[PDB]
């Protein structure tokens, strides 16, 4: 989150009025809460999985500009983490297919699996 | 005798007695062919493309050596039931890993109209080879469904194969 937020809120980038709404089922620790309290006016957090359409309507993903998915690079199974990202893009496209998903994969064949989704 | 009724309640059903004003198997019920060969039923993509299959049945399987044996004999039995004719009997092709197909072929040999395509059910080229478009019904089965312990893997393959076929 820190490496993402510095690149997203950097002075060199044009001023951004866009807010950032996180969504993660694990409740954050005190240091992540302190990071949110730092970038208070620009970021909000909301606990929940992405595999719940009630959670997606709660974070207003249909009214959201673009969804982003950050993959765990350092994982013990580069296919299982790939699979979790697959299921996340599946759930977001199942709720609202008219949204822009910016995600990150771990191989090249998984790009075809992403292409399998109709939207 | 007794009458099998399909009404919406028990009390509605409780009105009938109240208101009164070789070519087959060794048994007969199925079809049996001689034990064929795994090399006879393995096809390649070009051979399956030249094999014209219209209205047929394709079965997708996500099986491996670590996966449990599903058991497909119960699946393929009422396809070869003798309530139709041999010309009416559909053709079946199995798409998946040849390891799981070898693990199950020792059960799967006494049945006609059965092919095997080793490969991957996610392969769009393999689906175009087996003509899923003309295929009457694609059946997507999963074998690793009771060894994986996560919704992320739970039916993940089945969902991908369905979405690829729809796309
Ligand atoms: Ca009822
Ligand atoms: Mg705010």
d(CA B134, CA B116): 17
Question: Are the beta carbons of A103 and A113 closer than 8 angstroms?
Answer: no
Both tokens assigned to A49: 């999985």
Report angle CA A55, A56, A61 to the nearest 5 degrees.
150
Angle of the A109-116 helix axis to the B156-166 helix axis, nearest 10: 70
Q: Look at residue A80 and give its three-state secondary structure.
A: helix
Distance (Å) from the alpha carbon of B152 to chain A's nearest alpha carbon:
5
| Partner-chain contact A83 B167, CB within 8 Å | no
- B123 backbone dihedrals φ, ψ, rounded to 5°: -75, 115
Both tokens assigned to B76: 């393929």
Distance (Å) from the alpha carbon of B92 to chain A's nearest alpha carbon:
25
Four-residue CA torsion sign, A91, A96, A98, A101: negative
Question: Are the beta carbons of A112 and B167 closer than 8 angstroms?
Answer: no
Resolution of the experimental model in angstroms, please? 3.8
Residue A22, phi-psi category: left (phi > 0), alpha (psi -120 to 50), beta (remainder):
beta
Using a CB-CB cut-off of 8 Å, the residues of chain A touching B160 are 86, 113, 116
Using a CB-CB cut-off of 8 Å, the residues of chain A touching B151 are 51, 87
A33 is in an annotated binding site: no
A31, exposed or middle or buried, with CB in 10 Å at 0-12, 13-18, 19+?
exposed
d(CA A42, CA A19): 5
A44 is in an annotated binding site: yes
Question: What is the whole-number distance in angstroms between the Cα of residue A12 and the centre of ligand 2?
Answer: 23
CA atoms within 13 A on the CB side of B21: 0
Beta bridge partners of A116: none
* Among the partner residues B153, B159, B166, nearest to A118 by beta-carbon distance: B166
Question: Are the beta carbons of B18 and B29 closer than 8 angstroms?
Answer: no
Chain A's closest residue to B153, CA to CA, is A83
Question: Are the beta carbons of A79 and B129 closer than 8 angstroms?
Answer: no
Both tokens assigned to B54: 């219209």
Four-residue CA torsion sign, B30, B31, B33, B39: negative
Using a CB-CB cut-off of 8 Å, the residues of chain B touching A84 are 152
Both tokens assigned to A34: 């302190």
d(CA B97, CA B117): 8
Residues in Cβ contact with A48 at an 8 Å cutoff, skipping those fewer than 6 apart: A23, A24, A25, A55, A58, A59
Cα distances (Å, whole numbers) of residue B42 to A14, B57, B96, B101, B126: 60, 16, 11, 10, 13
Work out whether strand A100-102 and strand A66-68 pair parallel, antiparallel, or are unpaired. Answer: parallel
Four-residue CA torsion sign, A48, A3, A115, B67: negative
Q: Look at residue A99 and give its three-state secondary structure.
A: coil
Determination technique for this entry: cryo-EM
Write out the residues of chain B at the interface with chain A, using a CB-CB cutoff of 8 A.
122, 124, 150-153, 156, 159-160, 163-164, 166-167
d(CA B57, CA B93): 7
What does the buried/exposed string (b/e) look like for B13-48 if buried means 16 or more CB atoms within 10 Å of the residue's CB?
eeeeeeeeeeeebeeeebbeeeeeeeeebbbeeeeb
DSSP type of residue B154: T
| Partner-chain contact B167 A86, CB within 8 Å | no
Measure CA A91 to chain center.
12
DSSP type of residue A15: P
Both tokens assigned to B160: 């991908």
């Amino acid at each position: 989150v820190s490496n993402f937020l510095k690149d997203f809120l950097h002075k060199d980038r044009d001023d951004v009025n866009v807010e950032i709404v996180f969504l993660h089922n694990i409740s954050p620790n005190l240091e992540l809460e302190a990071l949110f309290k730092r970038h208070f006016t620009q970021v909000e957090f909301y606990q929940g999985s992405v595999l719940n359409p009630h959670d997606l309507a709660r974070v207003k993903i249909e009214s959201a500009d673009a969804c982003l998915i950050l993959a765990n690079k350092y994982c013990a199974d580069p296919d299982a983490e790939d699979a979790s990202n697959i299921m996340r893009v599946i759930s977001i496209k199942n709720y609202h297919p008219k949204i822009r998903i910016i995600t990150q994969m771990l191989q090249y064949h998984n790009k075809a699996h992403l292409l399998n989704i109709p939207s | 005798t007794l009458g099998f009724f399909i009404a919406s309640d028990a009390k509605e059903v409780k009105r009938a007695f109240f208101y009164c004003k070789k070519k087959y198997d060794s048994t007969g019920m199925f079809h049996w062919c001689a034990p064929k060969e795994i090399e006879k039923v393995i096809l390649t993509r070009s051979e399956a493309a030249m094999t014209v299959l219209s209205g047929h049945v394709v079965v997708c399987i996500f099986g491996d050596v670590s996966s449990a044996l599903i058991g497909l004999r119960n699946l393929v039995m009422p396809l070869r039931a003798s309530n139709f004719h041999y010309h009416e009997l559909k053709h079946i092709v199995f798409v998946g890993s040849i390891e799981y197909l070898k693990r199950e072929w020792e059960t799967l040999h006494n049945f006609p109209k059965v092919s095997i395509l080793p490969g991957t059910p996610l392969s769009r080229a393999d689906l175009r080879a087996v003509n899923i478009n003309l295929c009457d019904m694609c059946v997507i089965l999963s074998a690793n469904q009771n060894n994986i312990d996560d919704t992320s893997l739970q039916d993940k393959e089945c969902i991908l194969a369905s979405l690829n076929i729809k796309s």
